[PDB]
Design a protein around this ligand. Structure first.
Ligand SMILES: Nc1[nH]c(=O)nc2c1ncn2[C@H]1C[C@H](O)[C@@H](COP(=O)(O)OP(=O)(O)OP(=O)(O)O)O1
Ligand code: NA
Ligand code: NA
Length: 156
């Protein structure tokens, strides 16, 4: 059995567009992603997702709704990433570029799948259909899925 670390991922999804963030530096730059990071001690996962959204994008929201959970496993890494996925209820401000991340809106017929994590091609369509899901993806490096599961669920 492995240990898992908790992470969040927030999709700012509006009726016709979605906000994504492009990684500018570090390792993994060039890829568009939702907003999130590691859950911290003592906060609920949802509150951690809100905190990370604000830190990462500048957007503040009072509430999210949970839409999925995805476990990532990487060859050579014993720790699993347990990612809790949320969508925004409403927003009321503008996103901000940081030294690390550039936010950009995409129309929902221009979702930039080829420049997103490969798993997003599988689960983000469910998110657009307002379905809930559980997933698991095993990666070799950043680009190659060796095994995965995806299932629609009634409760995340
Ligand atoms: N395969 C994948 N598909 C996806 O859509 N999002 C992924 C992903 N793999 C990781 N992510 C997301 C999850 C989370 O929002 C983020 C990873 O969090 P980070 O490690 O950057 O967190 P922190 O910024 O809290 O970490 P520190 O560097 O310790 O400050 O990237
Ligand atoms: Na963090
Ligand atoms: Na980060």
């Amino acid at each position: 059995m492995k240990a898992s670390r908790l992470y969040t991922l927030v999709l700012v999804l509006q009726p016709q567009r979605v906000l994504l963030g492009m990684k500018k530096r570090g390792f993994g730059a060039g890829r568009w992603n939702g907003f999130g990071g590691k859950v911290q001690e003592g906060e609920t996962i949802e509150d951690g997702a809100r905190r990370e959204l604000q830190e990462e994008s500048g957007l503040t929201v009072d509430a999210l709704h949970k839409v999925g959970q995805i476990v990532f496993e990487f060859v050579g890494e014993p720790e699993l990433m347990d990612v809790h996925v949320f969508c925004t209820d409403s927003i009321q401000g503008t996103p901000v570029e940081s030294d690390e991340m550039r936010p950009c809106w995409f129309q929902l017929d221009q979702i930039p799948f080829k420049d997103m994590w490969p798993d997003d091609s599988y689960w983000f369509p469910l998110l657009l259909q307002k379905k809930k899901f559980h997933g698991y993806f095993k990666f070799q490096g950043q680009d190659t899925i060796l095994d995965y599961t995806l299932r629609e669920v009634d409760t995340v």
